[PDB]
Amino acid sequence: VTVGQVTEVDKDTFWPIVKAAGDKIVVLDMYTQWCGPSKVIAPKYKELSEKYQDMVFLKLDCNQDNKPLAKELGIRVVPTFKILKDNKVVKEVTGAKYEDLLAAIEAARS
Amino acid sequence: TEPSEKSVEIMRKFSEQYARRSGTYFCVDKGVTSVVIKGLAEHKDSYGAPLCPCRHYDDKAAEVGQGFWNCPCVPMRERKECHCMLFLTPDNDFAGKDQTITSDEIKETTAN
Amino acid sequence: TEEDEKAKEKIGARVRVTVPLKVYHVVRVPEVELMGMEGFIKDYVVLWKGKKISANLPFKVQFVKEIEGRGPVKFFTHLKEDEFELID
Numbered sequence A: 001v002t003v004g005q006v007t008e009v010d011k012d013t014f015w016p017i018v019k020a021a022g023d024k025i026v027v028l029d030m031y032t033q034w035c036g037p038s039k040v041i042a043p044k045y046k047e048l049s050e051k052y053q054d055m056v057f058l059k060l061d062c063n064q065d066n067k068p069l070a071k072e073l074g075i076r077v078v079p080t081f082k083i084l085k086d087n088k089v090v091k092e093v094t095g096a097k098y099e100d101l102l103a104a105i106e107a108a109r110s
Numbered sequence B: 001t002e003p004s005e006k007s008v009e010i011m012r013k014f015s016e017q018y019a020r021r022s023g024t025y026f027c028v029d030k031g032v033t034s035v036v037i038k039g040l041a042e043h044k045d046s047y048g049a050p051l052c053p054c055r056h057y058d059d060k061a062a063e064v065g066q067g068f069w070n071c072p073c074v075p076m077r078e079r080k081e082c083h084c085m086l087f088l089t090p091d092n093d094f095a096g097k098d099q100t101i102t103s104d105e106i107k108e109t110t111a112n
Numbered sequence C: 001t002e003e004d005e006k007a008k009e010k011i012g013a014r015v016r017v018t019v020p021l022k023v024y025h026v027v028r029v030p031e032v033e034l035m036g037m038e039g040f041i042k043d044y045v046v047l048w049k050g051k052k053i054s055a056n057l058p059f060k061v062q063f064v065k066e067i068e069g070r071g072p073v074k075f076f077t078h079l080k081e082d083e084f085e086l087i088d
Ligand code: SF4
Pocket: B036, B051, B052, B053, B054, B069, B070, B071, B072, B073, B074, B076, B081, B082, B083, B084, B085, B086, B087
């Protein structure tokens, strides 16, 4: 994964990237193709990845192909953000709530 | 995939009359409106009903049958809560002045 | 789940709304504030033909509200568990 940018992942590439992250925190944007608010927050998510260059930013299209991973991670609201440390989800943020995502990243870093 | 023209037009007409009936308005960025309308159309095409495009579902056929998340969903019908930002109450900061949107607007704002 | 089982056991129970909640679908009543209103759980629906579904206001609650010049108006509102308390 190139850090400083947002990497598209799927049901097969996501967990190996999490495993390879080591001591880096991973953020995941779970989106769908036609959720309006997903597209609104997407550029702000990209700017977060350009600021937090010591974290790994990913995005997952929760479509039919990737449904096994969507089901395993857990998602009901679109968007949903996951924050992962040490091979597991530690935090989630539901909705297109930029300030909530920022606060959760900051909390995860403390 | 891309929704059929006919389903997009179904969901466009729906959005206009439902915004009028519910006293709500389209987002200042009508690209947001257009994307959600296309999601409703795509879900109609694929599952038989315009399930909310900002929700994730396990069994689509069961969600279609039960209907809670079929647009207009229960939170919208009862509480005027539209987390897709399709129908915005006038006090919302992102509510614009329009209750109409043309097919040309839908195509232009979603061309990319 | 036990939560689903214990929720289904509350069907028929009288409840009071415990939080501010405005609803807009009551026929010819543009806006109703539900806080403090009492009704009963009409249904709890998280299954459809045996499949679990994702409705996030699963308690369908029946209310009757007196409207001046109209008499009692019966309606339903969907609630989640943290919006009401059992009356007993
Ligand atoms: S939140 Fe409800 S009313 Fe709004 S687009 Fe999604 S399904 Fe329709």
